[PDB]
Design a protein around this nucleic acid. Sequence first.
RNA 1: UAAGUUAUUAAGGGCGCACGGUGGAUGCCUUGGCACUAGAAGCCGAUGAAGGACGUUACUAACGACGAUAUGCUUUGGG
Length: 53
Amino acid sequence: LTTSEIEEQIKSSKEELFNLRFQLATGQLEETARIRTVRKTIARLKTVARERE
RNA sequence: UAAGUUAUUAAGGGCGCACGGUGGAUGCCUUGGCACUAGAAGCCGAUGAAGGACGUUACUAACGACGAUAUGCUUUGGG
């Protein structure tokens, strides 16, 4: 859905990535494979929203 | 302790030979080039061009690829 697609990307996958990058810099964030996995999730959400228009 | 005569020494050097260094010629190689044949095909840009700067990865100087959807995203067919 138009709104659900936006809500999931804005509050989730964005603030979630903020914590990962923040946690890593402090030196207490393992599981590095979770950043790239979330980075590309936003790319797919913005691909559907742009073509659906 | 007479008259006469002729040798060794090699501080160093010369010639020959043996065995080592320095140096990168020669032989054998090719990821790179040069001269051509035939068939395409001979422009891009204000709907922002040709070339550039700065950025993008789990840590990333710099080469290639990408542009805040950043070392990639979707879909349609090959494997």
